Amino acid sequence: GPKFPRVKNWELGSITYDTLCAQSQQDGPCTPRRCLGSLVLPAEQLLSQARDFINQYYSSIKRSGSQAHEERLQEVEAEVASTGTYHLRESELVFGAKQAWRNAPRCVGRIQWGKLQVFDARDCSSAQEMFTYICNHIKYATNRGNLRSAITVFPQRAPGRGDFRIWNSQLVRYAGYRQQDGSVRGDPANVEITELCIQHGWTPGNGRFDVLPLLLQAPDEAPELFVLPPELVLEVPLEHPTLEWFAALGLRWYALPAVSNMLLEIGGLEFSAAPFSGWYMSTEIGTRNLCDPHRYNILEDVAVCMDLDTRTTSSLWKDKAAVEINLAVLHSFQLAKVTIVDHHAATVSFMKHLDNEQKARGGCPADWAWIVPPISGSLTPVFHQEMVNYILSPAFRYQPDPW
Amino acid sequence: KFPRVKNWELGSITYDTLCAQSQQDGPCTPRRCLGSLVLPRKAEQLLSQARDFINQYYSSIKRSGSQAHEERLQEVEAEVASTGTYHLRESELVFGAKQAWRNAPRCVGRIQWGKLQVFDARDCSSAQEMFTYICNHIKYATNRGNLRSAITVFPQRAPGRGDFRIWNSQLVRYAGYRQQDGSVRGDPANVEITELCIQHGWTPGNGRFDVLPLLLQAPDEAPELFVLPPELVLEVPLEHPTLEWFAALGLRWYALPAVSNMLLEIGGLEFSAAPFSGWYMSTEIGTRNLCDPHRYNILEDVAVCMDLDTRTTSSLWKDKAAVEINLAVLHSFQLAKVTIVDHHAATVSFMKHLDNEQKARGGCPADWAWIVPPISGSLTPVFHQEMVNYILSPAFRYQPDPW
Ligand code: HEM
Ligand code: HEM
Ligand SMILES: Cc1cc(N)nc(CCc2cc(N)cc(CCc3cc(C)cc(N)n3)c2)c1
Ligand SMILES: Cc1cc(N)nc(CCc2cc(N)cc(CCc3cc(C)cc(N)n3)c2)c1
Ligand SMILES: C[C@H](O)[C@H](O)[C@H]1CNc2nc(N)[nH]c(=O)c2N1
Ligand SMILES: C[C@H](O)[C@H](O)[C@H]1CNc2nc(N)[nH]c(=O)c2N1
Ligand SMILES: [Zn+2]
Secondary structure, rough: OOOEEEEEEOOOOOOOOOOOHOOOOOOOOOOEEEOOOOOOOOHHHHHHHHHHHHHHHHHHOOOOOOHHHHHHHHHHHHHHHHHOOOOHHHHHHHHHHHHHHOOOOOOOOHHHHHOEEEOOOOOOHHHHHHHHHHHHHHHHHHHHHHHOEEEEEHHHHOOEEEEEEEEOEEOOOOOOEEEOOEEEEEHHHHHHHHHHHHHHHHHOOOOOOOOOEEEEOOOOOOEEOOOHHHHHHEEEEOOOOOOOOHHOOOOOOOOEHHHHHHHHOOOOEEEOOOOEEEOOOOHHHHHHHOOOOOOOOHHHHHHHHHHHOOOOOOOOOOHHHHHHHHHHHHHHOOOOOOOOOOHHHHHHHHHHHHHHHHHHHOOOOOOOOHHOOOOHHHHHHHHHOOOOOOOOOOOOOOOOOOO | OOOEEEEEOOOOEEEOOOHOOOOOOOOOOOOOOOOOOOOOOOOOHHHHHHHHHHHHHHHOOOOOOHHHHHHHHHHHHHHHHHHHHOOOOHHHHHHHHHHHHOOOOOOHHHHHHOOOOOOOOOOOOOOOHHHHHHHHHHHHHHHHHHHOEEEEEEEOEEEEEEEEEEEOOOOOOEEEEEEEOOEEEEEEHHHHHHHHHOOOOOOOOOOOOEOOOOEEEEOOOOOOEEOOOOOOOEEEOOOOOOOOOHHOOOOOEEEEEOOOOHHHEEEEEEOOOOOOOOOOOOOHHHHHHOHHHHHOOHHEEEEEEEEOOOHHHHHHHHHHHHHHHHHHHHHHHHHHHOOEEHHHHHHEEEEEEEHHHHHHHHOOOOHHHHHHOOOOOOHHHHHOOOOOOOOOOEEEOOOOOOO
């Protein structure tokens, strides 16, 4: 066959050849000797990255080689020459931002990539203004439960000058209080960050679901702390359809999944503060956040209520419970009329996504372990899809925690 | 150079130093990760792969440098020098067999790698004799239901001649009969193989669980059809603790998972027929075999007996039903007194295996996407554990289909 990787679907029996990977300008962790695919974390150089993105842009508008294409090129090196950086045009930001989401090997919601609201915030001057900008994002994106994908782009990393940073990892997060015995009250994922807000004068609450304040950082200034108006932070009380007691557990989650600690890289430019929001997939809440032994860990609690034999694994008690918990998440979101998507619908649309991208780009970089859901793995069609994972740009990046 | 493997549940960290002993290549390159591909589209070497294997053995029994070691190495040099190949001593073979399993990155059951009965069938000359071995291996491994891991090793490949092969992928397989309706009564995975048997003379039944005969091949001979005496094959009808209608589904599965299509490499000699068997981990039966859309596919049926809401995905009927089916399997096997391990027990013992091998060898190759079971991934400790994949020798390979 062809000299690009072959890509079977073992359910349908279909084949495809990924030609997109040939565009990757970035090494990953794997080598012919060993595969590190399962690891979570893995000047002139600018000019040529910049040139690259511009060609992408111009091709995306079908003008590859034309007078405006080669003038914008002339223009970009003119800027770099005399300053070391350069700036994106309004629509260039829009394209590159969409291109980063499109390129994200670990997101399963990519079928939605074309529809995303790019909120330009490169005019932002202070931590106060950051907050305001953000409050607007949450309001738009949340849209009273009929959610809408968006990203707010704050300004970009500069030579020897501070970064714009959101200290929190998500915009909405529950507190995590280290107890004087050893336990954690709240979300254990958010211990450190809780511990940092108090250190910067936050008065902590008491409960399993205390919404955290925002730690925003303007360049060179210390981080300023900001409390989200409660009316802004839409939450969903959880309850089971048929199990009447579930509602009494006092469990809950928030509507807006919005990542705030990732780096948005476009054509060499680095946007250190550019939080994006979508909507949740049922399992993120119900299988990861609530049942991970290192998170809310509510599996044993709920199985006791369901009255299952937890003295032995053969009872598949863990399984059973997880399913009801997931279902409680779905029903409860649907009932409160807030956008959500179960793992079956989500994966079925990712299949359509992969088919769409084959036609258009000749490939789609996918992180299999990440695309396949944390329950009911082989029941979703993606589990039977072989997947190439490589790094394309524009991209999102992990970046060091600022403190 | 040496990779940092993390567990995210516990925050614990290791470094893998074992991967440096890998001499073979994998699919990944630094440009793109192919870890998810199921299979790989892929006088002097033998001398060095032997020396280095023989080295392992003597090092493994503490006599590394001794009389017997020195003198065995010269046995090999002399045997390859005159014959272009050499032969293994039975102990040496027993060692290799145990090791190749130990190295199988996609095997979750490797906690047991030390406990393996090894049948030396290297003095086989007829498909007749093969069938006696195969029959005897089964009678041993099954043990009235108290299963015991085994491998039986037919003659090594040789350059002047064709291989000893078993045509079946497993020693026990249900026939999949094709039908005018574009339908498949029986197991869809065994359609091609059922048709071969027919072509080769066997009378077919027309049940959903018709145990297939064996097609055995001595070098350069036409394959031959041997039937397994019904009694040797242990089956388990499936019932369900709570639900009485389940058994009336007439579902059933066989006790012994025994792979017969793979090749065993040791000291660079190739063992083309070398079946091996252990015991089932329940998900293989209740999830993949019984619910794969391209297999027996009972998910809809079952669910409809359960009177669930098939009409939409968000009722989580696919998951709900999957679980009952997995549960049905465990109960049935525990009831019929037949070795089985559920995904919870197993992955736990594998986490122990990782730890044992960590101290013993400084690592352990593992294929994350095959170790994490096909339901309730995140609910098993493996999900949260980083894993390095690489090719250690002795090893099982895939090989072409003989026909
Ligand atoms: C529209 C609804 C969306 C859904 C249902 C969705 C789904 C998901 C899920 C389930 C994950 C795995 C996260 C985890 O389990 O830890 C993920 C990862 C990711 N998604 Fe989305 N996503 C959506 C929207 C978005 C949007 C709007 C963006 C960017 C604007 C985005 C970019 C990403 C990125 C960069 C990752 C990988 C981040 C990481 O490495 O932690 N997704 N997606
Ligand atoms: C003893 C109890 C055992 C258990 C519970 C077990 C479990 C498993 C499971 C669940 C798989 C995944 C295969 C799939 O779902 O398609 C697997 C793969 C594998 N196991 Fe085991 N195993 C056991 C014993 C053995 C033995 C005795 C051997 C060899 C002597 C072995 C070697 C392998 C190999 C080579 C694979 C890869 C299969 C392939 O690539 O097609 N295991 N094991
Ligand atoms: C701190 C940290 C570092 C790291 N390397 N990995 C993790 C776990 C993965 C993860 C990380 C973040 N920051 C956000 C999500 C929500 C995922 C999400 C985002 C969007 C936009 C929509 C959606 N449905 N889900 C998931 C955390
Ligand atoms: C035909 C074929 C080719 C190919 N490349 N891949 C597959 C799927 C993987 C598979 C193949 C076979 N032959 C047997 C099992 C049972 C796995 C098993 C083995 C043992 C020894 C114990 C156990 N519990 N489970 C799994 C099938
Ligand atoms: C395409 C995908 O990698 C493939 O379906 C894998 C996934 N994980 C698996 N895990 C096991 N144990 N066995 C399998 O056959 C598979 N199939
Ligand atoms: C080690 C392993 O890769 C890790 O546990 C991954 C598995 N898949 C995941 N998938 C998602 N979406 N999020 C995660 O945190 C993880 N964890
Ligand atoms: Zn890889």
